[PDB]
Amino acid sequence: MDIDPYKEFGATVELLSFLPSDFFPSVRDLLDTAAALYRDALESPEHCSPHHTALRQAILCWGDLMTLATWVGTNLEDPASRDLVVSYVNTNVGLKFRQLLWFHISCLTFGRETVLEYLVSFGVWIRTPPAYRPPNAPILST
Amino acid sequence: MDIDPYKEFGATVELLSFLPSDFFPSVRDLLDTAAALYRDALESPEHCSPHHTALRQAILCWGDLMTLATWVGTNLEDPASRDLVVSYVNTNVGLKFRQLLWFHISCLTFGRETVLEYLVSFGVWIRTPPAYRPPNAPILSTL
Amino acid sequence: MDIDPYKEFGATVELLSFLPSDFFPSVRDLLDTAAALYRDALESPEHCSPHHTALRQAILCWGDLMTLATWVGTNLEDPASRDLVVSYVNTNVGLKFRQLLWFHISCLTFGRETVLEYLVSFGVWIRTPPAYRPPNAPILST
Amino acid sequence: MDIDPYKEFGATVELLSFLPSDFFPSVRDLLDTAAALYRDALESPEHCSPHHTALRQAILCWGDLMTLATWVGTNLEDPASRDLVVSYVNTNVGLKFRQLLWFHISCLTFGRETVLEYLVSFGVWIRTPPAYRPPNAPILSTL
Amino acid sequence: MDIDPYKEFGATVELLSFLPSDFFPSVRDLLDTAAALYRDALESPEHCSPHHTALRQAILCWGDLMTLATWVGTNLEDPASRDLVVSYVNTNVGLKFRQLLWFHISCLTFGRETVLEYLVSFGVWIRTPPAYRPPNAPILST
Amino acid sequence: MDIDPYKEFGATVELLSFLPSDFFPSVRDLLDTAAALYRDALESPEHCSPHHTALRQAILCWGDLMTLATWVGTNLEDPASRDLVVSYVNTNVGLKFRQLLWFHISCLTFGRETVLEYLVSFGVWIRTPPAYRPPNAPILSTL
Numbered sequence: 141m142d143i144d145p146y147k148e149f150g151a152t153v154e155l156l157s158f159l160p161s162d163f164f165p166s167v168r169d170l171l172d173t174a175a176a177l178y179r180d181a182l183e184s185p186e187h188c189s190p191h192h193t194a195l196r197q198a199i200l201c202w203g204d205l206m207t208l209a210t211w212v213g214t215n216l217e218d219p220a221s222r223d224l225v226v227s228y229v230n231t232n233v234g235l236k237f238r239q240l241l242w243f244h245i246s247c248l249t250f251g252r253e254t255v256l257e258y259l260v261s262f263g264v265w266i267r268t269p270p271a272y273r274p275p276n277a278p279i280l281s282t
Numbered sequence: 283m284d285i286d287p288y289k290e291f292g293a294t295v296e297l298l299s300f301l302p303s304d305f306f307p308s309v310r311d312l313l314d315t316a317a318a319l320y321r322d323a324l325e326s327p328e329h330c331s332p333h334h335t336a337l338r339q340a341i342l343c344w345g346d347l348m349t350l351a352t353w354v355g356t357n358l359e360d361p362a363s364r365d366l367v368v369s370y371v372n373t374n375v376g377l378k379f380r381q382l383l384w385f386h387i388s389c390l391t392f393g394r395e396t397v398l399e400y401l402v403s404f405g406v407w408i409r410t411p412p413a414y415r416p417p418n419a420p421i422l423s424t425l
Numbered sequence: 426m427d428i429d430p431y432k433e434f435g436a437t438v439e440l441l442s443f444l445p446s447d448f449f450p451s452v453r454d455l456l457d458t459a460a461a462l463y464r465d466a467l468e469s470p471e472h473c474s475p476h477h478t479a480l481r482q483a484i485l486c487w488g489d490l491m492t493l494a495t496w497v498g499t500n501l502e503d504p505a506s507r508d509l510v511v512s513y514v515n516t517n518v519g520l521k522f523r524q525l526l527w528f529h530i531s532c533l534t535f536g537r538e539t540v541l542e543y544l545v546s547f548g549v550w551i552r553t554p555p556a557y558r559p560p561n562a563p564i565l566s567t
Numbered sequence: 568m569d570i571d572p573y574k575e576f577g578a579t580v581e582l583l584s585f586l587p588s589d590f591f592p593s594v595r596d597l598l599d600t601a602a603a604l605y606r607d608a609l610e611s612p613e614h615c616s617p618h619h620t621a622l623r624q625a626i627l628c629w630g631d632l633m634t635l636a637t638w639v640g641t642n643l644e645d646p647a648s649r650d651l652v653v654s655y656v657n658t659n660v661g662l663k664f665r666q667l668l669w670f671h672i673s674c675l676t677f678g679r680e681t682v683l684e685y686l687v688s689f690g691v692w693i694r695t696p697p698a699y700r701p702p703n704a705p706i707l708s709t710l
Numbered sequence: 711m712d713i714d715p716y717k718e719f720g721a722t723v724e725l726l727s728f729l730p731s732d733f734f735p736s737v738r739d740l741l742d743t744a745a746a747l748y749r750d751a752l753e754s755p756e757h758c759s760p761h762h763t764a765l766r767q768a769i770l771c772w773g774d775l776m777t778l779a780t781w782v783g784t785n786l787e788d789p790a791s792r793d794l795v796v797s798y799v800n801t802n803v804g805l806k807f808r809q810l811l812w813f814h815i816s817c818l819t820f821g822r823e824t825v826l827e828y829l830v831s832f833g834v835w836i837r838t839p840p841a842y843r844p845p846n847a848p849i850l851s852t
Numbered sequence: 853m854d855i856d857p858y859k860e861f862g863a864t865v866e867l868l869s870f871l872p873s874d875f876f877p878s879v880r881d882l883l884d885t886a887a888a889l890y891r892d893a894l895e896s897p898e899h900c901s902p903h904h905t906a907l908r909q910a911i912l913c914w915g916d917l918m919t920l921a922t923w924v925g926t927n928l929e930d931p932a933s934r935d936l937v938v939s940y941v942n943t944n945v946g947l948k949f950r951q952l953l954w955f956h957i958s959c960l961t962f963g964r965e966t967v968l969e970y971l972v973s974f975g976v977w978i979r980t981p982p983a984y985r986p987p988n989a990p991i992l993s994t995l
Contacts, residue, residue: 141317141324143338148329165979173975175283176866185289190329196285197339204347204375211374212367221363225354232353233346249972262984277986280976296461402534405458406565409450414547416562426602426609428623433614460568470574475614481570482624489632489660496659497652506648510639517638518631581746687819690743691850694735699832701847711887711894713908718899745853755859760899766855767909774917774945781944782937791933795924802923803916 145240148190149247150256156239158263167202167234170241174199178248191252195244202237205229250280287382290332291389292398298385300405303377309344312383316341320390333394337386344379347371392422430525433475434532435541441524443548452487452519455526459484463533476537480529487522490514535565572667575617576674577683583670585690588662594629597668601626605675618679622671629664632656677707715810718760719817720826726809728833737772737804740811744769748818761822765814772807775799820850857952860902861959862968868955870975873947879914882953886911890960903964907956914949917941962992 146152174182174195181188182196209226216222246255262278288294316324316337323330324338351371358364388397403420410416431437459467459480466473467481494511501507531540547563573579601609601622608615609623636656643649673682688705695701716722744752744765751758752766779796786792816825832848858864886894886907893900894908921941928934958967973990980986 141313141321141341143325143342145339145342147327148335148338150327160984162981163984165981169979171283172866173870173979176864176870176975177972179283182283183285183289185292187290187332190332190335193290193332193335194339196290197287197336197343199283199285200287201339201343201346204343204378205350208347208350208367208370208375211370212363216363216366218360218363221354221358221360221367224358225350225367228350228353228357233350236346246976249976266984276988277984279980279986281973294461296457300458300461402462403566405461406531406534409454409458410564411447411450414445414448414551414562416564418561426598426606426626428610428627430624430627432612433620433623435612456568464568467568468570468574470577472575472617475617475620478575478617478620479624481575482572482621482628484568484570485572486624486628486631489628489663490635493632493635493652493655493660496655497648501648501651503645503648506639506643506645506652509643510635510652513635513638513642518635521631579746581742585743585746687747688851690746691816691819694739694743695849696732696735699730699733699836699847701849703846711883711891711911713895713912715909715912717897718905718908720897741853749853752853753855753859755862757860757902760902760905763860763902763905764909766860767857767906767913769853769855770857771909771913771916774913774948775920778917778920778937778940778945781940782933786933786936788930788933791924791928791930791937794928795920795937798920798923798927803920806916 145194146243149194149243149252151243151259155256155259156243158259160266161235163262164235164238164242167238167241170238170245171199171202174241174245178245189248191244191247195241195248198237198240198244202241205233205237246280250282254280254282287336288385291336291385292394293385293401297398297401298381300401300408301381302408305404306377306380306384309376309380309383312380312387313341313344316383316387319387331390333386333389337383337390340379340382340386344383347375347379388422392424396422430479431528434479434528434537436528436544440541440544441528443544445551446520448547449520449523449527452523452526455523455530456484456487459526459530463530474533476529476532480526480533483522483525483529487526490518490522531565535567539565539567572621573670576621576670577679578670578686582683582686583666585686585693586666587693590689591662591665591669594661594665594668597665597672598626598629601668601672604672616675618671618674622668622675625664625667625671629668632660632664673707677709681707715764716813719764719813719822721813721829725826725829726813728829730836731805733832734805734808734812737808737811740808740815741769741772744811744815748815759818761814761817765811765818768807768810768814772811775803775807816850820852824850824852857906858955861906861955862964863955863971867968867971868951870971870978871951872978875974876947876950876954879946879950879953882950882957883911883914886953886957889957901960903956903959907953907960910949910952910956914953917945917949958992962994966992 144151144153146156178192178195181192182199187193206229209229212222212225243255246258250258258278258280265273265278286294288298320334320337323334324341329335348371351368354364354367385397388400392400400420400422407415407420429436429438431441463477463480466477467484472478491514494514497507497510528540531543535543543563543565550558550563571579573583605619605622608619609626614620633656636653639649639652670682673685677685685705685707692700692705714721714723716726748762748765751762752769757763776799779799782792782795813825816828820828828848828850835843835848856864858868890904890907893904894911899905918941921938924934924937955967958970962970970990970992977985977990
């Protein structure tokens with residue numbers, strides 16, 4: 141039972157792996173943006189959209205992960221393990237949660253088609269040599 | 283934030299708490315029925331239903347957690363802490379995943395209203411003292 | 426000014442005294458059920474139903490009682506009184522609040538007529554000798 | 568839970584707090600006017616009004632509390648603690664029952680909108696400094 | 711850029727200076743009244759009225775002032791300054807916030823025209839010698 | 853109470869927190885543009901708009917705070933505490949007044965929807981890592 145989280149929204153991991161791992165903003169920033177622009181419709185009793193249902197599950201799961209992190213941080217006596225698993229969550233789980241939260245928050249702000257074309261437009265731009273690419277990097281709009 | 287995993291589905295965490303932790307089947311037997319009944323809907327390019335999206339995200343997160351578990355298992359250098367956090371993943375995390383998987387699979391199988399009426403009825407029966415509790419517990423069945 | 430709490434809902438204390446004092450589930454369980462299935466319509470600014478207005482007053486009053494209990498538990502120096510009144514609230518006030526909360530929560534879940542007939546159906550069953558009664562005890566439904 | 572005894576009646580606990588604790592008449596004089604004006608509606612098999620149901624439950628609860636009080640009085644074996652908790656029932660519980668009885672009896676007598684406008688007006692008058700406070704306090708009257 | 715807060719509501723500082731500085735009830739009482747009769751429509755996402763928008767800003771600003779007061783009360787080592795600025799906020803800023811909150815809360819309860827005439831009716835009464843004025847001081851109504 | 857200065861204007865404090873404290877211009881340059889563009893609307897006997905009323909109250913409150921500041925300056929007898937609380941007024945209070953003035957002036961100038969879309973876009977750009985952040989930051993302009 142292997143399932144791409146991005147498959148039902150017309151994306152793929154290979155498409156989000158197209159943008160640099162340094163292009164996705166932090167989990168804190170992404171979570172704060174979700175809290176500022178969409179906290180009410182994320183705590184609503186309705187299936188606002190397929191993009192809303194996914195973001196809710198994602199936030200709850202990152203929460204579970206950080207809870208595990210704190211449990212290791214308090215209930216492990218060993219300082220070696222206590223560091224290792226928390227640094228593993230913060231970075232190795234960090235990227236795939238940064239790509240998930242970025243993608244769904246962007247499809248809410250700018251629309252799915254706008255975010256699926258920015259993934260191909262910005263990706264093909266980063267690959268064009270700088271002497272031949274529009275001087276300014278793409279950004280999301282409207 | 284204060285989001286409830288069951289709020290969009292007519293339920294809440296405390297409504298599902300009408301069932302004891304012993305009621306819910308194992309994660310492995312929940313994933314075994316997800317693959318047996320809905321592997322072609324889960325692995326498809328369609329948002330069949332909200333339940334389908336939620337269950338997909340849930341399976342992918344259980345996967346991430348178990349991967350953490352295996353990583354701590356093969357990459358940690360202290361047997362005692364390794365063991366102690368793998369206990370966290372299988373038990374202290376397992377109960378809430380066995381309830382989210384249980385709800386989304388049973389809703390796909392019997393329909394949302396049915397599963398919610400079932401929660402309410404099982405609740406009435408478990409609050410009934412055992413000396414007066416009829417020996418047929420409520421059950422979800424296709425009939 | 427002597428008033429039966431169950432009189433306006435077609436019941437009587439003699440009718441609720443028909444079911445065993447061990448048949449009513451605990452105050453904690455009843456309060457948790459009210460919180461899980463009806464907390465929103467109990468905190469609403471409307472007279473949802475005559476059954477809703479009564480349950481609200483009941484919860485608030487059990488609250489007052491448990492507050493008195495804690496006041497005895499903290500502000501009485503004497504351990505004898507401090508035990509005695511709290512055990513008196515937990516058991517002697519416990520049953521009549523278990524019957525009240527059970528009755529109104531059941532009339533919300535299953536309907537008043539359904540709960541008034543279950544009180545006569547289950548009562549007459551417990552009195553029939555076991556060799557001649559349907560093998561399975563009644564339960565509330567629909 | 569966070570239920571307000573006045574929320575279904577267009578009021579709140581802090582709206583009724585516009586009146587000082589000294590304003591409310593005694594529990595015994597509140598029960599004396601409940602029996603004088605509405606013993607046949609309170610003791611009936613009809614839910615005349617939401618106010619009637621609320622007042623019924625209230626009287627039955629004051630009764631339970633006073634029964635506790637008398638029980639602690641005749642069954643406790645320490646005069647000091649007995650006395651000290653009977654003080655709790657008559658004073659520290661009495662104020663909120665003298666305000667719930669006061670509101671439901673005055674609403675039955677003058678109608679809900681009247682009683683609420685009265686709360687607001689008495690509030691305006693009590694916030695007015697005494698040097699400028701007109702000597703006629705607001706009052707509920709049948710006219 | 712000098713602006714009367716009362717100018718857009720048909721009042722003036724000279725009109726509110728007409729009633730004694732002892733006639734306005736305390737900030738605590740005024741704030742409690744706002745919390746009891748209008749807390750929901752003051753926390754709403756709509757411009758309920760020009761009188762509502764002003765009261766919100768006023769409450770938030772008195773809050774800022776009392777925050778400054780507590781900052782002096784905790785972060786100043788000197789007990790002389792720590793007393794002086796807090797007593798200055800409580801009394802010298804106290805009156806103009808008591809007049810503001812009174813005025814807007816009254817225009818909500820009794821209507822703007824009712825509160826603008828009570829300011830002239832009560833003011834002219836306090837100035838009439840007691841032998842020739844209606845025996846009872848005016849009060850707001852309806 | 854829990855009132856938000858931006859809740860009636862389609863915004864919230866955490867939505868405006870998409871912009872860093874360094875972004876907002878000085879209080880004096882905010883008051884200089886308020887007088888340059890809207891001194892005849894602010895000083896008028898009309899409630900032109902909700903924005904106008906809010907900005908009026910805001911300016912009058914900044915005035916009160918600065919007056920406190922000057923009073924502590926000329927009337928306090930300890931240079932150290934005087935200085936230390938004037939720092940409070942100009943810095944620890946200045947940021948939230950430079951954001952309330954900034955929002956109400958920019959809404960008067962460009963219209964509410966524009967300013968809110970701008971907050972969202974600037975947010976997207978600031979969350980973008982600098983290595984991929986296009987050198988044109990978003991800006992409000994009459995065009």
